[PDB]
Amino acid sequence: KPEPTDEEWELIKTVTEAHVATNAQGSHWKQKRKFLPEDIGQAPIKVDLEAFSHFTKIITPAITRVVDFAKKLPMFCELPCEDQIILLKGCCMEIMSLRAAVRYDPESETLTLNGEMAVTRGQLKNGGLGVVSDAIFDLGMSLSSFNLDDTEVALLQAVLLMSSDRPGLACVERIEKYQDSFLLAFEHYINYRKHHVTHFWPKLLMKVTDLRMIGACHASHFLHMKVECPTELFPPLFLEVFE
Amino acid sequence: ENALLRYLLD
Ligand SMILES: Cc1nc(C(=O)NCC(=O)O)c(O)c2ccc(Oc3ccccc3)cc12
């Protein structure tokens, strides 16, 4: 099974470095980790407003790190501005969920958001995410066995960022060329890594789909939050990305 | 309409 070409190694260096430079708290994320108090985020009597405001206040730096990732990718930078905006709005929730899911800790059963905040399945659920909370936590639980490293995470983010099917894109064929390069590097790296899971590549492709479902859901649960909270209550960068 | 996200993309 074929391993990376020199061009693909160079590409893998680029994405991996982009990812490491923009991953909150880096190696230290378990040390800088504050567990959100347990009284914050219990089930109402719909949306717990206290946990909602904590989540509201960290979504903005998390969206910004995704933007920083895309900007460190040379292929991304050659896209016109509106394509970049479309591509970022499309993959922001996907990449943030991946980044939270690979920080699932089975001993405490928490995800770490923003390199700093450990939340439980119940807190993220009752703070507004609803069933999408279960989706991200289930993903984290199942990714533990895939033992993804920084490079595999980086490549997954690049594959999601370079999605030519988002509505409105001008350079659809250009974007699919970029995605095809990442997918090839990603597979050849997987071949080289020799994970001890059968059909790793087909299973990873299903994870990509799991993430694209989390990303497509955030519309059904953008409205689930605007049932209670006026639009003023969300930070502006969140409103832009999610509508 | 994406004033802030446009700015962040410089
Ligand atoms: C899905 C995800 N993720 C992250 C995150 O930090 N992921 C890991 C990382 O980027 O390092 C967040 O910080 C989120 C914050 C809020 C959120 O929804 C809400 C937004 C507003 C109100 C309620 C929930 C989803 C997040």
CA angle (A38, A39, A43) in 5-degree steps: 105
B8/A67 touch (CB, cutoff 8 Å), yes or no: yes
Show which residues on chain B lie within 8 Å of chain A, measured between beta carbons: 1-6, 8-10
Please tell me the distance from the alpha carbon of residue A136 to that of residue A119, in angstroms, as a whole number. Answer: 12
Q: Which residues pair with A105 in a beta bridge?
A: A110
> How close, in Å, is residue A191 to chain B by CA atoms?
35
**Collapsed DSSP state (helix, strand, coil) of residue A117:** strand
**Collapsed DSSP state (helix, strand, coil) of residue A46:** coil
Would you say how long chain A is, in residues? 243
Please tell me the distance from the alpha carbon of residue A204 to that of residue A206, in angstroms, as a whole number. Answer: 5
> In Å, what resolution does this model reach?
2.7
- The answer to whether A97 and A214 are in contact (CB under 8 A) is yes
Phi, psi of A162 (to 5 degrees): -85, 60
CA A72 – ligand 1 centroid, Å: 21
Side by side, the strands of the sheet bearing A110-113 are: A34-35, A117-120, A110-113
DSSP A123: H
- The answer to whether A85 and B5 are in contact (CB under 8 A) is yes
Q: A23 Cβ partners below 8 Å, 6+ apart? A: A29, A65, A99, A115, A150
Helix (H) or strand (E) holding A35: strand A34-35
Single-letter amino acid, residue A104? Y
Domain boundaries, chain A: 1-243
The residue written with tokens 């509106």 in the block is: A82
Experimental method: X-ray
Say which of B1, B4, B10 has its CB closest to residue A237. B4
CA A103 – ligand 1 centroid, Å: 13
CATH assignment of A1-243, among 1.10.10.10, 1.10.565.10, 2.60.40.1530, 1.20.120.530: 1.10.565.10
Phi-psi region of A114 (alpha: psi -120 to 50; beta: other; left: phi over 0): left
Strands A110-113, A117-120: pairing is antiparallel
Please tell me the distance from the alpha carbon of residue A15 to that of residue A75, in angstroms, as a whole number. Answer: 10
Q: What is the dihedral of CA A216, A209, A164, A19, to 10 degrees?
A: 100
- The answer to whether A72 and A17 are in contact (CB under 8 A) is yes
Please tell me the distance from the alpha carbon of residue A158 to that of residue A210, in angstroms, as a whole number. Answer: 16
Q: A113 Cβ partners below 8 Å, 6+ apart? A: A55, A58, A62, A100, A119
Tokens at residue A118, please?
Answer: 């450990």
Extended strands (E) in A40-172? 110-113, 117-120
CA A1 – ligand 1 centroid, Å: 37
B2/A85 touch (CB, cutoff 8 Å), yes or no: yes
Beta-carbon count within 10 A of A145 CB = 11
DSSP secondary structure of A177-197: HHHHHHHHHHHHHHHHHT-SS
